[PDB]
Design a protein around this ligand. Structure first.
Ligand SMILES: [Mg+2]
Ligand SMILES: [Mg+2]
Ligand SMILES: [Mg+2]
Ligand SMILES: [Mg+2]
Ligand SMILES: [Mg+2]
Ligand SMILES: [Mg+2]
Ligand SMILES: [Mg+2]
Ligand SMILES: [Mg+2]
Ligand SMILES: [Mg+2]
Ligand SMILES: [Mg+2]
Ligand SMILES: [Mg+2]
Ligand SMILES: [Mg+2]
Ligand SMILES: [Mg+2]
Ligand SMILES: [Mg+2]
Ligand SMILES: [Mg+2]
Length: 290
């Protein structure tokens, strides 16, 4: 019934994924992407400093998927992380871990490329992990790595997944992640950012994530959330705190697209209601003074 042996080859892995995918609701693509992300996260979790503290913390949509589970989260394309070391070292250690392998998975990591960053002294880098299972190509995962900002890597949450255990790979999965206060600060900054007129802010999906994060935030963590928000907004030195949650004209359908699959949750169903919910959250954070 549950597999007592790991998949012998890629085809067995795929066949088990489709079985698990049907067996519990999910489009086969979303489950495969989740599993690929977990494998990458496992390589990332082997990166530690000489005290054993993580060098890489997961953030963004992959973090929320780990926190809440596939059913209760948005689909994340990116595997985004914050790094406590320069990217050359991070990339080298990922490459070593990916060659050594884990539970039959190996990975190649492509070349990190800078992306346009206004408020980062060190800009984020993007690259890709090409995963194989037992020497056979399995999937590709986009990775994004940004540098530490203020105290957003001072502590971490640890989230687990059992998706690999479902297909007969028993090793425990435990992923270090940025804490909710700093996730809120970064998403609030991103969703209220004004972008130079060549490109426009398409980040309506951050209004969904911020509502999901608000539901997870402990009331006793409201004051550290304010401190994190102040820190990020002052470090990036762009628009000031507290921000106004503005909606752009193309956001109504973008927001609706980000809600798809989250009907069972109490979320704003329209971008107007979402902007109002997030603005009330901003006001609540701003009042939690030290
Ligand atoms: Mg095969
Ligand atoms: Mg199965
Ligand atoms: Mg299926
Ligand atoms: Mg370094
Ligand atoms: Mg690349
Ligand atoms: Mg700080
Ligand atoms: Mg900690
Ligand atoms: Mg962000
Ligand atoms: Mg508090
Ligand atoms: Mg505090
Ligand atoms: Mg105004
Ligand atoms: Mg806005
Ligand atoms: Mg919808
Ligand atoms: Mg709609
Ligand atoms: Mg509120």
């Amino acid at each position: 019934k549950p597999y007592s042996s790991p998949p012998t080859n890629l085809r067995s892995l795929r066949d088990r994924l489709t079985q698990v995918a049907e067996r519990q609701g999910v489009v086969f693509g979303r489950l495969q992407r989740h599993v690929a992300m977990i494998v990458v996260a496992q390589f990332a979790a082997t990166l530690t400093d000489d005290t054993g503290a993580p060098l890489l913390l997961v953030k963004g949509g992959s973090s929320l998927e780990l926190r809440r589970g596939i059913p209760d989260s948005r689909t994340s394309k990116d595997f985004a992380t914050v790094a406590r070391r320069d990217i050359e070292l991070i990339h080298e250690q990922l490459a070593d871990a990916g060659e050594t392998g884990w539970e039959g998975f190996t990975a190649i990591f492509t070349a990190p490329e800078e992306i346009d960053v206004p408020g980062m002294p060190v800009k984020p880098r993007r690259f890709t992990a090409k995963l194989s299972y037992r020497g056979r190509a399995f999937a590709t995962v986009p990775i994004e790595v940004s540098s530490v900002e203020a105290g957003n890597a001072d502590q971490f949450d640890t989230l687990t997944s059992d998706a690999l255990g479902l297909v007969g790979v028993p090793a425990a999965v435990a992923v270090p992640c940025m804490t909710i206060p700093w996730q809120i600060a970064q998403k609030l900054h991103a969703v209220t950012a004004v972008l130079e007129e060549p490109k426009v802010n398409d980040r309506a999906h951050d209004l969904v994530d911020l509502q999901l994060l608000e539901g997870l935030l402990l009331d006793a963590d409201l004051m550290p959330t304010r401190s994190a928000c102040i820190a990020i907004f002052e470090a990036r030195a762009q628009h000031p705190w507290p921000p106004r949650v503005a909606t752009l004209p193309h956001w109504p359908l973008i927001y609706a697209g980000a809600l798809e699959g989250l009907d069972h949750l109490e979320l704003a169903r329209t971008v107007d209601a979402a902007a109002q919910a997030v603005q009330r959250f901003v006001a609540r954070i701003d009042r939690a003074t030290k």
